[PDB]
Amino acid sequence: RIPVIRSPLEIRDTERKGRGVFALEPIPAQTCIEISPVLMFSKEEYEQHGQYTVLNEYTYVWSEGKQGLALGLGSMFNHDRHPNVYWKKDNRNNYISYYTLREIKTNEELCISYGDHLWFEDE
Amino acid sequence: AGHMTSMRIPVIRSPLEIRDTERKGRGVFALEPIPAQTCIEISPVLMFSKEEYEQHGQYTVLNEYTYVWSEGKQGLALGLGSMFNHDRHPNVYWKKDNRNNYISYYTLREIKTNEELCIS
Numbered sequence: 001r002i003p004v005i006r007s008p009l010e011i012r013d014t015e016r017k018g019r020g021v022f023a024l025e026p027i028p029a030q031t032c033i034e035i036s037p038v039l040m041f042s043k044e045e046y047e048q049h050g051q052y053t054v055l056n057e058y059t060y061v062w063s064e065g066k067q068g069l070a071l072g073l074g075s076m077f078n079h080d081r082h083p084n085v086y087w088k089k090d091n092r093n094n095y096i097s098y099y100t101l102r103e104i105k106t107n108e109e110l111c112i113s114y115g116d117h118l119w120f121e122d123e
Numbered sequence: 124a125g126h127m128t129s130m131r132i133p134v135i136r137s138p139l140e141i142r143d144t145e146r147k148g149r150g151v152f153a154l155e156p157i158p159a160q161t162c163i164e165i166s167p168v169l170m171f172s173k174e175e176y177e178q179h180g181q182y183t184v185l186n187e188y189t190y191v192w193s194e195g196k197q198g199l200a201l202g203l204g205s206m207f208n209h210d211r212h213p214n215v216y217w218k219k220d221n222r223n224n225y226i227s228y229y230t231l232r233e234i235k236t237n238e239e240l241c242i243s
Binding site for chain 1: 127128129130131132133134136137138139140141142143149154167169170171175176178179180182183184185188199201202203205206223
């Protein structure tokens with residue numbers, strides 16, 4: 001259901017800027033670089049408790065007021081105003097897939113939008 | 124003396140897959156054999172303070188996934204580390220890096236195609 005995606009990625013973890021995902025070699029546009037299984041929180045447990053933790057910084061809104069944390073590499077992409085990675089949520093199989101918006105050059109950070117949204121590729 | 128730290132960590136591309144299991148929910152399975160003592164995953168840990176875990180985090184489904192850490196902290200393994208089922212006869216062991224907040228996972232023995240990789 002979710003096998004290894006052998007993308008040329010590494011994680012940089014610096015005292016300065018924390019963690020981020022960076023390209024080891026060039027990557028073509030529209031390449032699936034990550035499929036993250038999601039840890040799902042019910043609306044009530046997130047509203048009552050989850051939102052008061054560091055979860056708040058990483059989760060993705062989900063259907064019916066649920067809230068998902070992306071496992072795999074998904075929580076490691078930083079947010080940027082000019083993102084080069086976009087995502088798709090899968091409600092049936094509980095994952096999020098990441099893709100490149102354009103050609104990525106080596107040493108570029110992979111970054112997603114600050115924005116969230118609620119539609120699913122499977123709907 | 125010295126400077127700020129800086130690490131570049133591989134995303135280990137082990138031949139592993141996530142599948143749903145009947146009894147235990149999602150689990151991690153081998154797509155091909157794997158030698159013993161092979162590093163199959165290095166998971167970044169998202170850390171919860173003692174206080175946010177005791178007040179909030181333990182009341183959520185985090186409670187089912189986190190690893191006890193020093194000083195009443197709890198770590199949630201990102202990467203594949205939260206996806207391994209627990210088993211009485213594990214074929215994977217882990218080590219915590221307390222300096223950097225990672226967990227590394229290594230095969231205890233050779234793994235067969237289609238075997239489920241489990242920790243204790």
